[PDB]
């Protein structure tokens, strides 16, 4: 009436919960790159010679 060893298991199942990968879009930056410093339009000379 006691507990005895039974037949060895024939296989093992290991369960884990996993989600999946999306598409590669690689959206690097809101406003991207190093935007260049640049000329103010027209500007004009702010200096003249004497005479």
């Amino acid at each position: 009436g006691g507990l005895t060893c039974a037949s060895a298991p024939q296989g093992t199942l290991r369960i884990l919960e996993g989600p999946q990968q999306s598409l590669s879009g690689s959206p690097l930056q809101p406003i991207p790159a190093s935007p260049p410093p640049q000329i103010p339009p027209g500007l004009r000379p702010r200096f003249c010679a004497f005479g």
Partner: protein, 63 residues
């Protein structure tokens, strides 16, 4: 003057020389001076500009 904003293609000297030439000065930043001692226009045109100087805390009055 942020580092790494001006490349080989877009140079800093090109940019600021265009800025200067747009004000009536010359591209390369050289304006020609006179000698305040002899009164003659020196043969070489000088490189003049505006730079930010700091004054250090080490004075001959303390050393």
């Amino acid at each position: 003057a942020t580092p790494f904003i001006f490349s080989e293609e877009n140079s800093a000297l090109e940019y600021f020389g265009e800025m200067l030439k747009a004000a009536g000065y010359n591209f390369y930043g050289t304006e020609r001076l006179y000698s305040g001692i002899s009164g003659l226009e020196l043969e070489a045109d000088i490189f003049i500009g505006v730079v930010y100087y700091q004054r250090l805390r080490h004075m001959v009055s303390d050393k």
